[PDB]
């Protein structure tokens, strides 16, 4: 019984149109947008049922578009993006309607840029075990910076020899900015993996430090020098040393 | 604002409890509900409360009095996974959005039994150039203040060694700035006295 949205991340520039889907539980009746600034702050957008658009909050903007067509999903349309529309959106669904629990989405992050010249992905680097923490804690910590990326849409994960590890591991909740002054600034990351001491002390142990970015696609056109800052993976890697 | 919560966050060691507060400024909304939201997910129906008294759900208490529309939720035996993001919602008697309270942040945090507060320098990689300065292995309760325009300082980092039964603070600094050091990385913090400072 999970409430489903895709995408998890758009960006895109202003004056544009962007789709927000949402597949709600099988049998709700009840469908309601919401949208959250900041990552606290939740507001009620618009619901529907009966096949048509009911309450409306004055942040709903009635040029945007809602509708639930018969086997799709519930979708919210966004036109023309402004960069006010930046916000994480969320769907939800009830069964019995008003009284009822409302089942939430995962949320679509919605970044809208004023252009897209600036998308940057992050560099990584890999940064090893202090020698002196090993002697003093027989323990090893990993750190991991992901930095200079642009917009804020990543998630980390630590491999070791190949299988993804979550175990030792915790990552910055949020991205920092990397000169505050701006509000076109580029973002930094960190990660830490601590492992016990004699595993990053077997060079047959092999740790990736990974990065994966939400970016351009190839339907966005490039002719900048630099390459297409797509949507990809970006990653650091080390082997165990004694 | 509608729904008013308190505190604005607040900070409870694992096992402990925890104390919500929610009030209305409008007596039309007199149905209630405790949502909770983790990072990078959806809220999620903790339990509703819409008739005076106590309810339950697991480690779980609402009470509500409507005569004064005060709304509470208590959590007891407080568990890691119990870190998020808690939001108060009322809706009218009469289907209708919610209305959120801004919510109040919970971490629950670890006890640190045999604390070894150090500030440690890890080399890059593939250039031995650049560094990064790792505090770790503080008490939870120290204070990791942000600080200069080109000197970056994370949050504390909360790691859990499962099969270790081991958790552990740090946060990370950096920096290209010419004065930048391990040793003066953390400054404007309040660090113990006894911070092993390695070289």
Request: proline share 8%; no cysteine.
């Given at each position: 019984p999970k409430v489903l949205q895709i995408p998890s991340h758009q960006i895109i520039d202003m004056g544009q149109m962007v789709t927000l889907n949402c597949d709600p539980?099988?049998?709700?009746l009840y469908f309601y947008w919401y949208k959250q600034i900041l990552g606290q702050q939740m507001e009620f957008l618009v619901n529907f049922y009966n096949g048509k658009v009911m309450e409306k909050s004055?942040?709903?903007?009635?040029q945007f578009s809602v509708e639930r067509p018969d086997g799709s999903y519930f979708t919210l349309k966004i036109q023309?993006?402004?960069?006010?529309?930046s916000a994480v959106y969320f769907c939800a669904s009830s069964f019995?309607?008003?009284?009822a629990e409302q089942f939430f989405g995962p949320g679509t992050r919605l970044t809208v840029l004023?252009?897209?010249?600036?998308?940057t992905p992050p560099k990584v680097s890999l940064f090893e075990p202090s020698k002196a923490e090993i002697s003093h804690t027989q323990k090893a910590t990993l750190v991991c910076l992901a930095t200079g990326?642009?917009?804020?849409?990543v998630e980390l994960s630590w491999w070791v020899n190949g299988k993804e590890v979550h175990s030792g591991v915790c990552t910055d909740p949020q991205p920092l900015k990397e000169?505050?002054?701006?509000?076109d600034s580029r973002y930094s990351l960190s990660s830490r993996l601590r492992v016990s001491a004699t595993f990053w002390q077997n060079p047959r142990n092999h740790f990736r430090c990974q990065v994966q970015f939400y970016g351009l696609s190839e339907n966005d056109e490039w002719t900048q020098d630099?390459?297409?800052?797509?949507?990809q993976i970006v990653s650091a890697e080390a082997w165990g040393r004694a | 604002q509608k729904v008013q919560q308190s505190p604005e966050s607040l900070s409870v060691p694992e096992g402990g409890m925890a104390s919500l507060n929610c009030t209305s400024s409008?007596?039309?909304?007199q149905y209630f509900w405790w949502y909770r939201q983790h990072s990078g997910e959806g809220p999620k129906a903790l339990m509703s409360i819409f008739s005076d008294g106590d309810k339950k759900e697991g480690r779980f208490t609402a009470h509500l009095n409507k005569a004064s529309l005060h709304v509470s939720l208590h959590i007891r035996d407080?568990?890691?996974?119990?870190?998020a993001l808690y939001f108060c919602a009322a809706s009218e008697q009469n289907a209708q959005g919610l209305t959120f309270g801004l919510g109040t942040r919970v971490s629950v945090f670890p006890y640190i039994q045999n604390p070894d507060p150090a500030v440690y320098q890890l080399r890059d990689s593939k250039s031995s150039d650049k560094s990064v300065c790792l505090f770790t292995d503080?008490?939870?309760?120290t204070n990791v203040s942000q600080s200069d325009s080109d000197v970056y300082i994370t949050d504390k980092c909360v790691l859990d060694m499962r099969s270790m039964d081991f958790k552990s603070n740090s946060a990370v600094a950096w920096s290209?700035?010419?004065?930048?050091?391990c040793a003066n990385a953390f400054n404007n913090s309040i660090i113990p006295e006894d911070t092993f400072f390695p070289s």
């Open positions: 539980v099988s049998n709700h004055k942040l709903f903007k009635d023309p993006t402004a960069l006010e529309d019995w309607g008003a009284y004023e252009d897209l010249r600036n998308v990326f642009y917009p804020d849409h000169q505050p002054a701006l509000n630099r390459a297409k800052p797509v949507t | 409008d007596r039309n909304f407080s568990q890691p996974s119990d870190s503080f008490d939870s309760q290209n700035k010419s004065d930048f050091a």
